[PDB]
Write an enzyme that holds these catalytic residues in place. Structure first.
Site, short mmCIF file in Angstrom:
data_model
loop_
_atom_site.label_atom_id
_atom_site.label_comp_id
_atom_site.label_asym_id
_atom_site.label_seq_id
_atom_site.Cartn_x
_atom_site.Cartn_y
_atom_site.Cartn_z
N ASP B 16 -16.30 5.95 3.04
CA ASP B 16 -16.07 4.52 2.90
C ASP B 16 -14.72 4.21 2.25
OD1 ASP B 16 -18.41 3.89 4.17
OD2 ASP B 16 -19.58 3.71 2.32
N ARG B 61 -19.82 13.68 9.09
CA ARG B 61 -20.45 14.83 9.72
C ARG B 61 -20.55 16.02 8.77
NH1 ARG B 61 -18.47 15.29 16.14
NH2 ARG B 61 -19.87 13.64 16.91
N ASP B 78 -12.14 -1.79 11.95
CA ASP B 78 -11.45 -1.74 13.23
C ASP B 78 -11.09 -3.14 13.70
OD1 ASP B 78 -11.79 0.97 13.17
OD2 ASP B 78 -13.06 1.08 14.95
#
Lengths: 190, 191
Positions: B16, B61, B78
């Site tokens: 984050d 991940r 985004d």
């Protein structure tokens, strides 16, 4: 709601009425605002804000809306808002000498999309993303109409309209992300 | 390129935080360089941070999971970043060029870069799909820009080309995505 019944009678679906309302709202915003017809533009955009609520009335008087209709209506609200701010931006950028105001307008343009986006995306992940749209339009359109009021206009009202909104909108963004942050399950790993 | 994610996790940075810093640097770059007419440098920086934001997913991940909030924050970022790219380019086009149709194309791109993502997010919020038709969008507008301001051998028209293709493509994408909503299972059942 009698209006909705009559519009159903002629062969209009709720989706068609949303698309036509949005098309008319966009055309109004992009025809009137760049010409400096800010009051007329504001009245037309408010009209088609109201006229687009008829899609829900028509769905109710058909025994049901659809999911697609919901998504289409929301997307259309985004398009219509983008068009409002784009028309105002054109007038502001090319027929005034207020570059800070150009900035404020662009902030409003982007935040009107992002505020809605946060909500939809929060829901797409099962979180909440609301709080902090009609009143945002009330602010910017009232500012514009008063700025171009058919009598006793107050030109500063546009800038006051826009600047307040720009601040209010940024805060809303932060607020909405916070509601995402504090949603149950927000921090669980997957 | 997962060792960068390995090392940034060690230091104590979450995905984050990396997303927030990447987005901030991208916005500062887009709004600082593009309005100045430094289009090539702006395109390089925006491309850099496009790639640099992939590190949030790499970190997620190699951390046994991203979070729901993280997904929402990354997507929101985004949208902010794309708005900033087009806003800087618009400032340049609107006040330092004499191309009004190009301003229109840039505004179309500005709005459609939001609406495209929105259609997807909203369809999913209703349990439908809304994808199909971003990486190539940025490829187009940033390549057009960088070539337009290309060091020593620029070809300015590349910007107008970049935008005009994107604007058209973007409109096409919008209707395509709504069609995907329309054709989702359950989309048109009345309720």
């Amino acid at each position: 709601t009698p209006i909705a019944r009559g519009l159903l009678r002629v062969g209009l679906t709720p989706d068609v009425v949303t698309i036509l309302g949005t098309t008319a709202s966009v055309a109004g915003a992009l025809t009137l605002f760049p010409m400096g017809k800010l009051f007329a533009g504001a009245c037309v955009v408010w009209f088609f804000v109201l006229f687009d609520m008829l899609d829900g009335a028509m769905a109710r008087e058909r025994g049901g809306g659809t999911r697609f209709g919901a998504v289409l209506d929301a997307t259309c609200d985004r398009i219509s808002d983008g068009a409002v701010f784009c028309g105002l931006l054109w007038w502001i950028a090319f027929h005034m000498r207020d570059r800070p105001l150009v900035i404020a307008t662009l902030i409003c343009l982007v935040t009107s999309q992002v505020i809605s986006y946060i909500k939809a995306r929060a829901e797409a992940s099962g979180l909440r993303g609301d709080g902090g749209r009609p009143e945002r339009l009330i602010i910017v359109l009232t500012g514009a109409g008063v700025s171009d009021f058919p009598f006793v206009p107050w030109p500063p009202a546009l800038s006051v309209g826009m600047w307040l909104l720009a601040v209010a909108s940024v805060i809303t963004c932060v607020q909405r992300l916070h509601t995402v942050w504090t949603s149950p399950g927000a921090i669980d790993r997957m």
